[PDB]
Design an enzyme around this catalytic site. Structure first.
Site, short mmCIF file in Angstrom:
data_model
loop_
_atom_site.label_atom_id
_atom_site.label_comp_id
_atom_site.label_asym_id
_atom_site.label_seq_id
_atom_site.Cartn_x
_atom_site.Cartn_y
_atom_site.Cartn_z
N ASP A 99 0.83 -1.20 0.00
CA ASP A 99 0.00 0.00 0.00
C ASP A 99 0.87 1.25 0.00
O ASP A 99 1.30 1.70 1.06
CB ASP A 99 -0.90 -0.02 1.24
CG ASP A 99 -1.85 1.15 1.29
OD1 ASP A 99 -1.90 1.90 0.30
OD2 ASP A 99 -2.54 1.30 2.32
N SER A 156 -0.37 15.42 -12.21
CA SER A 156 -0.57 15.04 -13.60
C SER A 156 -0.79 16.29 -14.44
O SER A 156 -1.34 17.28 -13.97
CB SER A 156 -1.79 14.13 -13.72
OG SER A 156 -2.12 13.84 -15.06
N1 U1Q Z 1 -7.77 3.03 0.12
C1 U1Q Z 1 -7.47 2.02 1.10
C2 U1Q Z 1 -8.50 1.32 1.72
C3 U1Q Z 1 -8.18 0.34 2.64
C4 U1Q Z 1 -6.83 0.09 2.88
F1 U1Q Z 1 -6.45 -0.86 3.77
C5 U1Q Z 1 -5.86 0.83 2.22
N2 U1Q Z 1 -6.21 1.75 1.34
#
Ligand code: U1Q
Length: 330
Positions: free
Chosen positions: A35, A199
């Protein structure tokens, strides 16, 4: 050093991507959601409330000879989809695709919200935003990339997400066979802790490119592409029958439609998202109304170049002294 790991969509819609990560000694392999929009490495565990675990693989720190409790440390995070998790903290050895960090903060969940429990394919998150967002208290902890950076051959990580197919996260090197053309680099602001860039504009299908600055974040942990209402309206206006649905929570369109592509600018370069990447399938099982992959950021406060956008590109997260982002077609 370098590392390289395959990342795989969790389902037939590419709702998220999971990458195997080795934690502890002997190794415990969990499938984590990498993430770039957050900065905590948290996992489902032996400490997670039992009723909140439903099929996930758990980390059991008591079975790791290298795990150490980080005394007094706790963590608690909430995400843009309203989900959340919290718990305590260990340090342990973490490896991704051959690259190892000793002493990495592994945040062990004591509680997770319903959307995490309901997703049996995601065993936790591996944050790759800037460490200033890490939620550990009272002593903030560093991300896996921040800890590994000094050891890497080059201080970079790359995301090569697939459409309905496996892809790759690489650490420490750029695979020059993985993209076409050149990589266009663009400036990043770290002031909000994100890979925040601007962008240079967009086009819908074969239409005229509109030069317009769109500040947003490169976020592998967000599924969809969230852009200003004007841009999103221009896109969906090209799709017969598309409409914004308050009941559903965004733009929907007939599942029988063939969607136009969407192009976004990176400097003078262009990344083209094929129309199929924008189809997120029936809004409910058996419906002929389908959910759109491009949605308005109006109710968010930030534009988000999520997986829909990033999967159309080879993306370099450059953690040099002055961080930048690179994008190439592929
Ligand atoms: N946009 C997001 C939603 C949940 C997560 F765990 C990480 N990012």
């Amino acid at each position: 050093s370098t590392g390289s790991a395959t990342t795989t969509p969790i389902d037939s819609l590419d709702d998220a991507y999971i990458t195997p990560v080795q934690i502890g000694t002997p190794a415990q392999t969990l499938n984590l959601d990498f993430d770039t929009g957050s900065s905590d490495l948290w996992v489902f565990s032996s400490e997670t409330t039992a009723s909140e675990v439903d099929g996930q693989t758990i980390y059991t720190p008591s079975k790791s000879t290298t795990a150490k409790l980080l005394s007094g440390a706790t963590w608690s995070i909430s995400y843009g989809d309203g989900s959340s998790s919290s718990g305590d903290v260990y340090t342990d050895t973490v490896s991704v695709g051959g690259l190892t960090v000793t002493g990495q903060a592994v945040e062990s969940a004591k509680k997770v919200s319903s959307s995490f429990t309901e997703d049996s394919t995601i065993d936790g998150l591996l944050g790759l935003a800037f460490s200033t967002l890490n939620t550990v208290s009272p002593t903030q902890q560093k991300t896996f990339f921040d800890n590994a950076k000094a050891s890497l051959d080059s201080p970079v990580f790359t995301a090569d997400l697939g459409y309905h197919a496996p892809g790759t996260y690489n650490f420490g090197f750029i695979d020059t066979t993985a993209y076409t053309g050149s990589i266009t680099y663009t400036a990043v602001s770290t002031k909000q802790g994100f890979w925040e860039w601007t962008s240079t504009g967009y086009a819908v299908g074969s239409g005229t490119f509109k030069s317009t600055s769109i500040d947003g974040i490169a976020d592998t942990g967000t599924t969809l592409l969230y852009l200003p209402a004007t841009v999103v309206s221009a896109y969906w206006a090209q799709v017969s029958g598309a409409k914004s649905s308050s009941s559903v929570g965004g733009y929907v369109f007939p599942c029988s439609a063939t969607l136009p592509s969407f192009t976004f600018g990176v400097g003078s370069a262009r990344i083209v998202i094929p129309g199929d990447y924008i189809d997120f399938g029936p809004i409910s099982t058996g419906s002929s109304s389908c959910f759109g992959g491009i949605q308005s950021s109006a109710g968010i406060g930030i534009n988000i170049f999520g997986d829909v956008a990033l999967k159309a590109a080879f993306v370099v997260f450059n953690g040099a002294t002055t961080p930048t982002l690179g994008f190439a077609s592929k």
